[PDB]
Amino acid sequence: EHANMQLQQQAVLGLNWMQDSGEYKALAYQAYNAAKVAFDHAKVAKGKKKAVVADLNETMLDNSPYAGWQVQNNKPFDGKDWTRWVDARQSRAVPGAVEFNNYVNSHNGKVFYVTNRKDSTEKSGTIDDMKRLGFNGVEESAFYLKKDKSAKAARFAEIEKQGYEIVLYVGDNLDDFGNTVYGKLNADRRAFVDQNQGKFGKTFIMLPNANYGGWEGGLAEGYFKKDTQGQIKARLDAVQAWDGKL
Amino acid sequence: EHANMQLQQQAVLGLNWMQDSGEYKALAYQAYNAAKVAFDHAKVAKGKKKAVVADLNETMLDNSPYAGWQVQNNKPFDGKDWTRWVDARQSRAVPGAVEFNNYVNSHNGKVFYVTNRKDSTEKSGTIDDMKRLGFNGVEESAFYLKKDKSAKAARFAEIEKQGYEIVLYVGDNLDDFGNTVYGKLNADRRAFVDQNQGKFGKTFIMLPNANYGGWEGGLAEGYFKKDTQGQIKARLDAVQAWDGKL
Ligand SMILES: Nc1ncnc2c1ncn2[C@@H]1O[C@H](CO)[C@@H](O)[C@H]1OP(=O)(O)O
Ligand SMILES: Nc1ncnc2c1ncn2[C@@H]1O[C@H](CO)[C@@H](O)[C@H]1OP(=O)(O)O
Ligand SMILES: [Mg+2]
Ligand SMILES: [Mg+2]
């Protein structure tokens, strides 16, 4: 129980930032302002329909109250708890997301939700929240929720097989742009970003998430297979510190 | 000493994100890609020179190793320690910052560094680091370091009085865009962002900083006047949590 409190306390400052700061809101607006510009500029091959692919969690939907519950109950992430959160139907919208979504859908485009919320158990709550939140276009066929694989490239391909050309991707996780660094450590993930420097803010649109993600598992080999104590040490070992001298 | 460790442990996860994640790098590239587009589009009044205003800390310069030192030594922020860090000359560059800086300066623009690093004690180390890092245009006159006031609007005005029109602002803190929410709590700061939604990614360019900022003081009245214990409670009280029920 000591390790659990320590692990979740380490998330507090970043959670305050995501939940309370105007700075976070500004970053969300910045991403979606850029996304609209990219969508408007996009041209697709003859015969293709324009598609935008968007992740949900921490991209279009704000699940910060779940993180707040982890902090307050010293609870590390558990898929069983997550499913209850989804069923709770208290998701909020990331600033600018609804407007951008609805703009795309009313301007000769279609947003597809490629998300790792679970198709079997988490679909009903997701669709309910998004309708309440004001998203247009949330019929079941717009959703590619998780079934067998967490990697998303196969779903992107399903979308292209339906006659769409994907003009841009929106996400908070690099794995939202393809599979090339799925399950990889942060060194490789940073290298992927470097190799794609010019796409960010154009065809790859980023939202900030300092609370969780592929970068967490990226902190150390077999991070998620570690116990709570091992994860704390992984985080602290990853820290780069000034030695305090000149 | 117990409170000090707790306070700084709360920063760990967000520090891992800023230091290690490819996601953070992608956000930095996204901001600077957008900044170049805005700079290229900008037109100024007749007779004016084009200026870009940029903050340094966590906007163009990466001081994360200082934060890492705080974590490892259970040290809350202290201006005396900060000055030593600056003097240490180990600052790194935020991804994309040098290239954008040098592009502006070679394309009929001038970047001015409006920064709260201290003009008297922290200028020499700043200029030394920026030269090493590859920034062009780091003569003393490009810098508007802190003298008497932390609020930046007066410095922006000094720049305009020199015959420049400021075409865009780059920062990680909303106070980097003006004084309207300086010293204000987060509710007012979010409202400022909402009232300027369309400027973000255009004339106000944001970099992510989940480690510190005006949003921290924004968590509670007289936050920085609080003792370590009071600040921990301020952070935890600001948390919004799911109740765990449906
Ligand atoms: N703290 C956390 N750790 C892991 N996954 C989280 C999480 N918070 C929310 N999630 C979501 O829970 C599911 C399991 O990882 C994913 O859908 C993920 O969102 P994602 O779809 O955006 O990746
Ligand atoms: N953790 C922290 N808390 C307060 N200021 C910090 C800080 N880390 C770096 N700084 C910098 O230290 C000075 C005092 O606040 C400012 O120059 C600020 O950067 P800034 O100029 O970007 O605002
Ligand atoms: Mg996500
Ligand atoms: Mg700054």
XYZ file of C-alpha atoms and ligand atoms in Angstrom:
540
model
C 0.000 0.000 0.000
C 3.003 2.268 0.565
C 4.303 1.638 -2.956
C 0.840 2.222 -4.433
C 0.534 5.655 -2.819
C 4.031 6.659 -3.953
C 3.406 5.496 -7.523
C 0.185 7.505 -7.854
C 1.487 10.555 -6.003
C 4.070 10.882 -8.780
C 1.200 11.731 -11.154
C -0.245 14.650 -9.180
C 1.572 17.683 -10.631
C 1.002 16.600 -14.239
C -2.635 15.910 -13.388
C -3.029 19.441 -11.954
C -1.559 20.735 -15.204
C -3.902 18.747 -17.428
C -6.995 19.437 -15.308
C -6.598 23.052 -14.147
C -4.193 24.940 -16.418
C -5.212 27.311 -19.180
C -1.932 26.223 -20.766
C -3.308 22.743 -21.383
C -6.470 24.211 -22.978
C -4.279 26.408 -25.206
C -2.349 23.360 -26.397
C -5.629 21.579 -27.225
C -6.908 24.577 -29.201
C -3.539 24.872 -30.920
C -3.708 21.230 -32.071
C -7.256 21.507 -33.381
C -6.619 24.865 -35.052
C -3.713 23.226 -36.862
C -5.855 20.166 -37.664
C -8.498 22.306 -39.399
C -5.813 23.970 -41.525
C -4.428 20.573 -42.553
C -7.899 19.184 -43.307
C -8.818 22.194 -45.456
C -5.541 21.919 -47.407
C -5.816 18.173 -47.979
C -6.465 16.739 -51.414
C -7.032 13.016 -52.022
C -6.617 10.695 -55.018
C -9.471 10.582 -57.542
C -12.370 8.428 -56.351
C -11.281 8.541 -52.691
C -13.265 9.972 -49.795
C -11.435 12.171 -47.250
C -11.015 10.549 -43.853
C -9.596 11.874 -40.586
C -8.505 9.301 -38.025
C -8.757 10.330 -34.395
C -7.969 8.618 -31.125
C -10.453 9.135 -28.275
C -8.833 8.909 -24.829
C -6.906 12.134 -24.070
C -7.313 13.159 -27.705
C -11.043 13.851 -28.071
C -12.300 12.574 -24.679
C -11.048 13.825 -21.318
C -10.831 11.022 -18.740
C -8.930 13.037 -16.134
C -11.462 12.325 -13.368
C -10.426 8.670 -13.592
C -6.804 9.689 -13.003
C -8.026 11.802 -10.084
C -9.695 8.699 -8.648
C -6.400 6.790 -8.943
C -4.603 9.550 -7.076
C -7.211 9.640 -4.296
C -7.478 5.877 -3.895
C -3.816 5.005 -4.467
C -4.883 2.837 -7.413
C -2.497 1.952 -10.261
C -4.221 1.479 -13.622
C -6.501 -1.547 -13.816
C -8.563 -2.391 -16.878
C -11.375 -3.605 -14.641
C -11.601 -0.196 -12.964
C -11.274 1.533 -16.328
C -14.332 -0.320 -17.676
C -16.380 0.886 -14.703
C -15.206 4.452 -15.382
C -16.351 4.149 -19.004
C -19.696 2.694 -17.918
C -20.013 5.634 -15.508
C -20.591 7.948 -18.499
C -18.784 11.004 -17.117
C -16.270 11.504 -19.933
C -15.682 15.129 -20.905
C -14.505 16.578 -24.244
C -10.982 17.782 -24.992
C -11.240 21.509 -25.820
C -11.732 22.169 -29.551
C -12.357 18.482 -30.342
C -16.140 18.618 -30.873
C -15.946 21.657 -33.142
C -13.184 20.118 -35.247
C -14.986 16.768 -35.426
C -18.243 18.407 -36.534
C -16.465 20.666 -39.017
C -14.797 17.707 -40.746
C -18.066 15.776 -40.908
C -19.914 18.746 -42.441
C -17.177 19.585 -44.942
C -16.872 16.559 -47.192
C -14.918 14.517 -44.651
C -15.489 11.722 -42.129
C -13.791 11.274 -38.759
C -13.223 7.666 -37.743
C -12.607 6.897 -34.091
C -9.720 4.469 -33.850
C -9.575 3.887 -30.137
C -8.445 1.291 -27.624
C -11.621 1.544 -25.598
C -13.052 -1.982 -25.828
C -15.603 -2.780 -28.533
C -17.330 -5.478 -26.478
C -17.673 -3.807 -23.069
C -16.948 -0.108 -23.500
C -18.764 0.821 -26.721
C -22.185 1.714 -25.293
C -20.817 4.171 -22.735
C -18.499 5.740 -25.308
C -21.272 6.409 -27.812
C -23.578 7.713 -25.093
C -20.972 10.191 -23.794
C -20.038 11.431 -27.259
C -23.685 12.108 -28.151
C -24.137 14.040 -24.900
C -20.904 15.933 -25.519
C -22.162 17.177 -28.900
C -20.133 15.086 -31.339
C -21.853 14.630 -34.711
C -21.350 11.416 -36.673
C -21.219 8.922 -33.804
C -23.096 6.073 -35.456
C -21.564 2.652 -34.715
C -19.856 2.401 -38.104
C -17.655 5.438 -37.368
C -15.973 3.499 -34.571
C -13.043 1.137 -34.746
C -12.814 0.091 -31.099
C -10.344 -2.473 -29.781
C -11.080 -6.114 -30.447
C -8.047 -8.413 -30.645
C -5.098 -6.021 -31.081
C -4.011 -2.797 -29.368
C -1.825 -1.840 -32.355
C -3.862 0.369 -34.671
C -2.358 -0.001 -38.151
C -4.695 -2.843 -39.148
C -7.707 -0.647 -38.356
C -6.261 2.227 -40.401
C -6.015 -0.245 -43.281
C -9.649 -1.382 -42.815
C -10.644 2.257 -43.229
C -8.613 2.636 -46.443
C -10.183 -0.574 -47.818
C -13.576 1.129 -47.493
C -12.552 3.692 -50.120
C -11.177 6.405 -47.851
C -7.875 8.217 -48.000
C -6.715 9.208 -44.507
C -5.638 12.851 -44.731
C -4.472 13.291 -41.133
C -4.243 11.524 -37.787
C -4.989 13.008 -34.379
C -3.683 11.424 -31.172
C -1.894 11.842 -27.849
C 0.184 8.659 -28.279
C 2.763 8.046 -31.031
C 1.101 4.634 -31.565
C -1.876 6.641 -32.823
C 0.117 7.307 -36.018
C 1.089 3.732 -36.897
C 2.767 0.600 -35.561
C 6.429 1.378 -36.168
C 7.210 1.979 -32.466
C 4.442 -0.001 -30.794
C 5.840 -1.750 -27.723
C 9.192 -0.027 -28.195
C 11.281 1.884 -25.664
C 11.488 5.671 -25.646
C 14.810 5.898 -27.498
C 13.196 4.328 -30.585
C 10.020 6.398 -30.144
C 11.981 9.675 -30.064
C 13.837 8.501 -33.178
C 10.502 7.946 -34.939
C 9.510 11.503 -34.052
C 12.824 12.873 -35.356
C 12.383 10.933 -38.609
C 8.939 12.525 -39.005
C 9.698 16.020 -37.699
C 7.914 17.812 -40.550
C 4.612 15.919 -40.215
C 3.783 17.175 -36.716
C 1.138 19.892 -36.789
C 0.403 18.909 -40.397
C -0.564 15.265 -40.986
C 0.210 14.026 -37.438
C -1.665 16.162 -34.910
C -0.576 15.835 -31.254
C -2.473 16.407 -27.997
C -0.563 16.552 -24.676
C -0.880 13.755 -22.100
C 1.569 13.816 -19.185
C -0.539 11.313 -17.238
C -0.073 7.970 -19.081
C 0.789 6.361 -22.415
C 3.183 4.326 -24.535
C 5.948 6.596 -23.208
C 5.371 5.132 -19.737
C 5.996 1.555 -20.847
C 8.802 3.072 -22.898
C 10.666 3.972 -19.698
C 12.086 0.449 -19.298
C 12.103 -3.063 -20.758
C 9.090 -5.012 -19.498
C 7.872 -2.018 -17.488
C 4.230 -3.101 -17.281
C 5.290 -6.605 -16.262
C 7.100 -5.037 -13.298
C 5.479 -4.813 -9.864
C 4.601 -1.449 -8.323
C 8.001 -1.155 -6.640
C 9.799 -1.891 -9.911
C 7.792 0.760 -11.740
C 8.664 3.427 -9.167
C 12.341 2.562 -9.596
C 11.945 2.603 -13.392
C 10.525 6.129 -13.249
C 13.171 7.397 -10.843
C 15.997 5.731 -12.800
C 14.795 7.421 -16.003
C 15.200 10.861 -14.418
C 18.037 13.009 -15.785
C 19.432 15.279 -13.071
C 21.915 18.140 -12.794
C 24.721 17.060 -10.447
C 24.430 20.373 -8.590
C 27.947 21.534 -9.477
C 29.451 23.959 -12.005
C 12.007 16.896 5.022
C 9.034 14.550 4.648
C 6.915 17.281 3.057
C 9.768 18.261 0.731
C 10.115 14.723 -0.627
C 6.354 14.397 -1.144
C 6.122 17.757 -2.917
C 8.894 16.900 -5.387
C 7.808 13.295 -5.889
C 4.555 14.687 -7.293
C 6.570 16.029 -10.248
C 8.161 12.737 -11.314
C 5.698 11.361 -13.892
C 5.395 14.683 -15.731
C 9.180 14.994 -15.659
C 9.552 11.519 -17.229
C 7.130 12.665 -19.915
C 8.995 15.880 -20.675
C 12.448 14.267 -20.551
C 11.980 10.833 -22.150
C 8.861 10.777 -24.334
C 8.833 11.090 -28.101
C 5.389 12.600 -27.542
C 6.924 15.672 -25.931
C 9.360 16.066 -28.865
C 6.423 15.782 -31.290
C 4.593 18.575 -29.478
C 7.706 20.783 -29.690
C 8.069 20.135 -33.428
C 4.350 20.735 -33.886
C 4.605 24.157 -32.201
C 7.619 25.252 -34.226
C 6.190 23.923 -37.493
C 3.104 26.023 -36.804
C 5.277 29.006 -35.814
C 7.103 28.957 -39.165
C 3.780 28.931 -41.023
C 2.553 31.922 -39.006
C 5.826 33.820 -39.490
C 5.797 33.242 -43.256
C 2.168 34.420 -43.503
C 2.691 37.530 -41.384
C 2.549 40.994 -42.886
C 3.338 44.145 -40.886
C 2.394 47.826 -41.196
C 4.460 49.958 -43.585
C 7.791 51.003 -42.079
C 7.719 48.283 -39.397
C 10.237 45.483 -38.962
C 8.926 41.952 -38.269
C 9.615 40.731 -34.751
C 8.987 37.375 -33.080
C 8.914 37.337 -29.290
C 10.016 34.128 -27.620
C 10.328 33.019 -24.026
C 13.413 30.960 -23.127
C 12.813 28.572 -20.214
C 10.817 25.524 -21.405
C 10.118 27.337 -24.670
C 13.513 27.504 -26.394
C 15.767 26.224 -23.566
C 15.333 22.875 -21.826
C 16.126 23.086 -18.101
C 14.784 19.638 -17.221
C 18.028 18.525 -15.546
C 17.380 21.185 -12.904
C 13.959 19.649 -12.237
C 15.679 16.260 -12.051
C 18.004 17.681 -9.396
C 14.982 18.889 -7.396
C 13.459 15.426 -7.556
C 16.690 13.737 -6.443
C 17.469 16.188 -3.655
C 13.908 16.803 -2.458
C 14.377 20.503 -3.237
C 11.427 22.834 -3.907
C 12.227 25.677 -6.310
C 14.691 28.232 -4.970
C 15.936 31.172 -7.006
C 19.361 30.813 -5.417
C 19.651 27.240 -6.694
C 18.244 28.279 -10.063
C 21.014 30.873 -10.517
C 23.638 28.188 -9.893
C 21.939 25.969 -12.491
C 22.096 28.805 -15.030
C 25.749 29.470 -14.195
C 26.375 25.739 -14.679
C 25.870 26.201 -18.443
C 24.175 22.860 -19.129
C 20.957 24.163 -20.697
C 19.734 22.167 -23.689
C 17.552 23.296 -26.622
C 13.847 22.559 -27.008
C 13.460 20.485 -30.202
C 12.857 22.635 -33.301
C 13.650 25.892 -31.465
C 17.112 26.577 -32.931
C 15.982 25.938 -36.501
C 12.944 28.186 -36.119
C 14.990 30.910 -34.417
C 17.629 30.857 -37.166
C 15.012 30.750 -39.917
C 13.278 33.877 -38.598
C 16.576 35.734 -38.256
C 17.605 34.864 -41.829
C 14.222 35.682 -43.358
C 13.661 39.366 -42.710
C 12.698 38.866 -39.067
C 14.229 39.197 -35.597
C 13.558 37.012 -32.561
C 13.685 38.836 -29.241
C 14.161 36.806 -26.086
C 11.731 38.062 -23.477
C 12.653 35.908 -20.535
C 12.532 35.915 -16.751
C 16.088 34.690 -16.412
C 17.784 37.533 -14.524
C 19.588 40.249 -16.483
C 22.089 40.960 -13.704
C 23.149 37.454 -12.648
C 21.931 35.018 -15.291
C 22.701 36.769 -18.588
C 26.260 35.523 -19.158
C 25.367 31.851 -18.758
C 22.284 32.240 -20.950
C 24.192 33.790 -23.843
C 26.985 31.238 -23.527
C 24.566 28.280 -23.657
C 22.606 29.673 -26.595
C 25.782 30.203 -28.641
C 26.874 26.631 -27.901
C 23.404 25.343 -28.754
C 23.564 26.917 -32.227
C 21.198 29.871 -31.887
C 21.990 32.709 -34.307
C 21.336 36.308 -33.282
C 22.256 36.107 -29.597
C 23.923 39.494 -29.253
C 23.034 41.268 -25.987
C 20.518 43.592 -27.641
C 18.273 40.664 -28.644
C 17.628 39.944 -24.973
C 15.038 41.435 -22.679
C 15.913 39.649 -19.439
C 14.186 40.309 -16.124
C 15.113 43.458 -14.264
C 12.412 44.908 -12.001
C 9.209 43.167 -13.150
C 8.272 39.557 -13.923
C 5.273 40.686 -16.008
C 6.357 40.921 -19.636
C 4.024 43.416 -21.323
C 6.307 46.398 -20.667
C 9.159 44.610 -22.452
C 6.910 43.798 -25.421
C 6.174 47.525 -25.595
C 9.903 48.421 -25.473
C 10.342 46.205 -28.523
C 7.494 47.921 -30.405
C 8.981 51.343 -29.544
C 12.128 50.273 -31.408
C 10.161 50.130 -34.667
C 9.154 46.472 -34.636
C 5.754 44.911 -35.098
C 5.472 41.668 -33.115
C 3.979 39.091 -35.484
C 3.780 36.171 -33.049
C 4.655 35.109 -29.516
C 6.120 31.782 -28.440
C 5.904 30.566 -24.839
C 5.038 27.782 -22.406
C 3.286 30.130 -19.948
C 0.147 32.181 -20.689
C 1.971 35.177 -19.147
C 4.261 34.932 -22.175
C 1.423 36.434 -24.251
C 0.651 39.495 -22.122
C -0.251 40.636 -18.616
C -4.005 40.092 -18.577
C -3.824 37.027 -16.286
C -0.509 37.601 -14.539
C -0.829 36.587 -10.891
C -4.354 35.307 -11.495
C -5.884 31.964 -10.544
C -6.496 29.213 -13.083
C -10.197 29.959 -13.595
C -9.307 33.388 -15.029
C -6.378 31.951 -17.009
C -8.595 29.329 -18.684
C -11.077 32.109 -19.477
C -8.297 34.087 -21.176
C -7.502 31.035 -23.293
C -11.175 30.585 -24.226
C -11.412 34.264 -25.202
C -8.398 33.775 -27.488
C -9.159 30.286 -28.810
C -8.415 31.161 -32.443
C -4.956 32.652 -31.801
C -3.362 29.434 -30.530
C -1.151 27.829 -33.159
C -1.308 31.098 -35.111
C -0.138 34.223 -33.260
C 0.210 32.584 -29.808
C 2.448 29.520 -30.077
C 2.423 27.117 -27.096
C 5.050 24.674 -25.804
C 4.097 22.074 -23.153
C 5.400 22.342 -19.576
C 3.831 20.022 -16.997
C 6.648 20.709 -14.527
C 6.077 24.322 -13.343
C 4.534 27.675 -14.252
C 1.899 30.330 -13.637
C -0.642 27.484 -13.563
C 1.003 26.208 -10.372
C 0.502 29.468 -8.489
C -2.901 29.482 -10.163
C -3.925 26.428 -8.126
C -4.788 28.523 -5.050
C -4.808 32.044 -3.613
C -1.372 32.907 -2.230
C 0.003 29.511 -3.263
C 3.663 30.546 -3.356
C 3.309 32.241 0.028
C 2.199 28.877 1.432
C 4.647 26.531 3.157
C 5.530 23.156 1.644
C 2.696 21.412 3.489
C 0.178 23.992 2.273
C 1.315 23.571 -1.322
C 0.877 19.792 -1.190
C -2.661 20.302 0.103
C -3.306 22.928 -2.590
C -2.298 20.459 -5.302
C -4.324 17.602 -3.842
C -7.370 19.832 -3.256
C -7.265 20.956 -6.901
C -7.607 17.355 -8.092
C -10.926 16.442 -9.730
C -11.783 12.793 -9.088
C -14.401 10.277 -10.205
C -16.337 9.126 -7.127
C -15.925 5.505 -8.234
C -19.658 4.895 -8.687
C -22.043 4.730 -11.656
N -3.635 5.617 -17.009
C -3.878 4.802 -18.025
N -3.035 3.756 -18.295
C -3.295 2.906 -19.351
N -4.410 3.109 -20.148
C -5.246 4.138 -19.874
C -5.002 5.002 -18.823
N -5.985 5.927 -18.792
C -6.842 5.670 -19.811
N -6.379 4.577 -20.496
C -7.037 3.898 -21.627
O -7.313 2.574 -21.200
C -7.153 1.648 -22.256
C -6.100 0.598 -21.914
O -4.802 1.136 -22.062
C -6.775 2.468 -23.473
O -7.997 2.690 -24.136
C -6.244 3.769 -22.909
O -6.589 4.852 -23.729
P -6.150 4.883 -25.274
O -7.214 4.182 -26.073
O -6.182 6.330 -25.662
O -4.796 4.249 -25.491
N 10.300 24.976 -11.283
C 10.350 26.287 -11.472
N 9.586 27.130 -10.709
C 9.646 28.495 -10.905
N 10.476 29.021 -11.880
C 11.237 28.187 -12.629
C 11.190 26.817 -12.450
N 12.037 26.241 -13.328
C 12.611 27.221 -14.069
N 12.105 28.425 -13.654
C 12.506 29.763 -14.125
O 13.031 30.449 -13.000
C 12.697 31.822 -13.032
C 11.897 32.223 -11.796
O 10.556 31.797 -11.918
C 11.918 32.030 -14.315
O 12.886 32.462 -15.243
C 11.418 30.650 -14.688
O 11.408 30.476 -16.078
P 10.570 31.469 -17.023
O 11.452 32.639 -17.365
O 10.337 30.701 -18.289
O 9.286 31.924 -16.370
Mg -5.244 8.151 -26.342
Mg 9.056 29.761 -19.750
